[PDB]
Point group: C2
Chain length 538, copies 2
Amino acid sequence: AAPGKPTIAWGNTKFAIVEVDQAATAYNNLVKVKNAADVSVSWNLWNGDTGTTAKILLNGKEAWSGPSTGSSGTANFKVNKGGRYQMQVALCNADGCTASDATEIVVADTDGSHLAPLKEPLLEKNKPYKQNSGKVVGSYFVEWGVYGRNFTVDKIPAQNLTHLLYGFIPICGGNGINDSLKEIEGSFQALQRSCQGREDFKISIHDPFAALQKAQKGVTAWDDPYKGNFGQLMALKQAHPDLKILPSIGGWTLSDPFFFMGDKVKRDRFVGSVKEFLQTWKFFDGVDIDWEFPGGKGANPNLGSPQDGETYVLLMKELRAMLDQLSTETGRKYELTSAISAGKDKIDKVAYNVAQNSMDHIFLMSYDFYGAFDLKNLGHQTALNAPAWKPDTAYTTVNGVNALLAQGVKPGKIVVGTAMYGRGWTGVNGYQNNIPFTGTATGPVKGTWENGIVDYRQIAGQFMSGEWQYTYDATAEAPYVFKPSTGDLITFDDARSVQAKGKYVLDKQLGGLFSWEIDADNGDILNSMNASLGNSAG
Amino acid sequence: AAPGKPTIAWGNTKFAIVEVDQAATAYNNLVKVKNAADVSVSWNLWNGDTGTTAKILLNGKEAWSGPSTGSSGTANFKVNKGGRYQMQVALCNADGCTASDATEIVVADTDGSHLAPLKEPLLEKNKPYKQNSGKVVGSYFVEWGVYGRNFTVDKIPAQNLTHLLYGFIPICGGNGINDSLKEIEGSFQALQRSCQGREDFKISIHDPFAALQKAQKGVTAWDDPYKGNFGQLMALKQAHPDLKILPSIGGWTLSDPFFFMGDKVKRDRFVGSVKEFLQTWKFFDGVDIDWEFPGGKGANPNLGSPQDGETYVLLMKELRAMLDQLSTETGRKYELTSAISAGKDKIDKVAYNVAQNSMDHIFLMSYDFYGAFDLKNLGHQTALNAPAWKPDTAYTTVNGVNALLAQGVKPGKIVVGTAMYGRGWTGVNGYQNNIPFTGTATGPVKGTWENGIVDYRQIAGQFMSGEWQYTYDATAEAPYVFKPSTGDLITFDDARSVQAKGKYVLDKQLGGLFSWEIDADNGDILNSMNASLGNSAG
C-alpha cells in the first residue's frame, strides 16, 4: 500500500536570499547577497510504511528528492525566488504517494516578495486621491524622522504620491571627504562605523539601525530579516507597486564627496557601488542625485570648482548608462533624477540642456530662498513670484524655472518644489508701510525641531490664532504669519500658494510638484498638491 | 564618560534545559536532559564608547562578563533554572555602566516554570467547587482522547479535581511482553517505534506526537519546546499547583510486562526507569500502578500466576523506597497509588493489608461489573449494592470495599470509583416482572466510540427522551434506561448514584471518589462527585 502520511517537524520556516547579520555595524558585514536561500525541512512518520522515496514540494513542484530510509528525514535544498510557498513532504512507493499537510515557508527578498502589503489608512487631514493627472507628485522621507519626529513609513499617505525619495544615502569617506558631517554630533562617527572596511567613494547606509533593524509595523518579529525603513518600504511597495521609491544620494551635509568625482577612478567606483546597491535593495526604482552644489556654496566653503558642471554632466551620462543596462537585465524601468538649486547663479554653473537627456526628472528646489541664515534680507522663502515691494527679487520660483527654460531644458522635466515647513525670524523691526519683510530681524524664529524652521503642521496648529496676523500676498503668491509684539515672522507654503504653483505647472506644462519633507505636513499641503495638478478625489 | 547604551541584537530567546528532538520518533532520541540551558546573546553599540567590560545580567544579576572589544559582541553562558528572565547587556568603564533595555528570555523546564498558567473557563455543565472536604476527587485523562474524542487538557475542569491520572504510560517490550497491544491496530507497532533502542521493561511514551508535539492551546508556537499533553499539563500545573498529576502505568492492554516482574533484574530495571521518568518530567507528582491483574484474568489468558500477589507487594515497597529518596532530594512529596479490581476473587489474590503501607491511595475500580462481554448475565455495572431481585449479586461496590476492609486495609486509603460512561446490551428478552436485567441480550448497545459503551454525555443528551424509559433503582442505587422496542438496555452512574456513593464514603470514612474517564462527562458526574463529598460551591 501507499506510504503513511508524514508530519512536518516543527522548525524554522523563514529563510533569506539577502541576509542581514544581526551583530554587525559595518555595512560590509551587515549584508550578504546569496544566489538562493538555503531551506531545510524535517518530517516524522508516526504511523505506517515510510515509502521508498521522500520528496519536498513547493506549491506541488518537487524541490528535493531522496530515498526514504526511516521514520524521520531532513532535506536541505536551495530556493532562488522570494515568496511564500506551501511546502509539503511526500512519501512515495510503487503503490502511490502520500503528501503531508502543507506548511507555509517564507523566502525573503529585497523585492518585499515575502511580505504582506503595508496598507494603512490615511491620517490627519490627508484625503485620498487617484493619480490620474500623469503629473509627478513627490515628497522626501528622511531616515532620521523615525526618532524624535516619530514619522514612520506606515504614516506616509502613499496613495497620494507617485514618487517617494529617501533622504539620504551617504558616500563613504573620512577626513577631507565628509567634513560637513562634523557639524552634526555623532554623524561623522556613525558614517565611519558604517563604512569600516569599505572603500571611500562607495555608497553606504548612514543609520543601519533605523534603516534595517528598528521594529516597525509589519516587520516586528525577531526573525523578519528586514525591519526598519527598508523593511516597511518593501511592504509599502507590495501595497503600491506603482509608487517609485528613489534613494537620494547627497543632501546638505552629504555632498562633499561629489566634489572629488572629477577623478574618474573615484567616479567609476561610485557608479559601480550604486549598481551594486540597486541589485542589493530591489525595492528601489532608480537613483536621485542631490549634489549641493556644483560650483560650491553648499555646507563646505572649501569645496567648489569650475570643473563641477562638467563632472556633473559626466556623472549623469554614466549613471544613465549603468541604469540602462540594469533595466535590460531585469526588465524594469529605472529612473535617474536630481534635486537642484533654484537660484539662477547656481543654475548657470551646469549645462542642464545637456544633462537633461540622462534625466527623467529635475526636482527644482524652489524653497529656502530666505531664512534665518540672513537676518538683514527678509523675503518669501518659496514664492512663485516677486513681491510688489521688491519686483526685482532674485530668488523666485519663476526665476528658477526661467533660468532652466532659457538653457533649453524641456518644461516637462521640471518638477516644482513646495515647502511643508516655514522659515522665520524673531525681532523684525524697522519695517515700512506694514511689510515686516522690509525690516530686519535680530534672530531666528523658535522652530519645531530646530531654530528658524517650523513644521507646517505646527504653523497650521498654533500660529493661526492668538496674536498672529495672517496675510496672503497675492502678487508673490505666498502667505505669512506675523506676531507684532515679538516681531516673530514666518514665510511658508499654504494650500493657496500650492494651488498657484499647481496651476503654474499646468499652464507652463511643467512635470509635477515635489515637497520637502512629508513628516511636517498635516495633509493640507499634499491634498493641495494633488488637487492643484488635477488628480481626482478617491 | 560612561559607555554608550548597547542594543540587544535580534535573535532566539527561547532555550531549554530538557530538550526535545523534533525529527526523532524513538523515546531515547526524543529527549535530552541537560544540566543547564545554553543561552546566547549578541549586542550592537550604534552610538558611543564601547566601554572596557561587557556583562550579561539576568534580573540584574551577572551571568557573563568579558572585555568589550568592539561595537558588537556575543556571550554564551549556561542557565540552570527554568523561568522567564529580564536580560540586559551592560557596558562598563571606570566612569560607570550603561545597561541596555531589557529583553525577556525563556529558559524551559519540565516544571512548566517558563509557561503562563493554562487557566480556562469551565465548560458544559461544569460548576465550580472549592476542594475543602479533604477527600480525593480524581479522574483519568486518556492520551488518545485528543484525536476523535477531541478532549484536550484545556477542557479539563481542573479546579474540580484533587488528582489527575494520565492514561497510560507503557512499559517497553516486544513479542511476548506486550501481546495484548496487538488486538488494537498499529498500537503494538507504535510501541516498538517509540521503544527502538530502549531496553525491555523500561517505561516510555506510547504516542510521543499527542504527548509532546501536537500544537494545543498555550503551546502553539513552533519553538515552544513542550507541546501536546505534557506541555498543557505543565501549564495547568502553573494554574493549579495543588492538583496532583500522576502518570498511570498499565491499563487493560498495557499490563503484560508486570507479569514478568517476579524476576528482580526486570523489576529493578523498571523501578529505575520510573525514577528517571519523574526526574525527566517534573510536573508529575508520583506514579499510579494499574496492573490488570495480579493472578491473571486481564487481556492475556496466558498470563497470571500465584506469585503475582508477592511481586505486587515487592513492587510497591520498592517504588515507595525510590519515591521516598526522590522526595528528599527534591523536597517534594511524591504519591504512590494503584487502580485495583473491585471483584472479591481478584482482591483475594493480593495482601492489601501489607501493600497499603507503601500506598497513598487505592483506586477501587467499582465499575465494569457487567457489560456486553456477558450477554447472559445482565446487571448494574457500577451499583453500590445488590439489586432486590438478586441480593447475592457478587459484583458490588460494597462487596469490593468489604473485601479490603476484611483484609485490614484502612478505610481512608480507599477511593471509590464512579463511571462517566454506561455499558449496554441490545435485544434484551425473556425478562420477568418488568426487569430487563432478568432477561438475556443478543448483542452490545451501539456505543459512542465503540460498541457496548456509551459516554454519559450522550446518555444524558439522547437517551432521556423518546422511547427510553428511565428507572432509578433505589436498592442497588443505580439508574438505567431501557428502550422496550429494540430491547436496548444501559447501566450507568447518574448524579443520584454518585450522591449515594459520596455519602457512603463519608459514612464509612473512605478516601474520596475517582472516575473513568473525564472526557465522557458533561459536568453532571463531576458536580455530583464534588457535591456529595461536601466540597463548597465556588
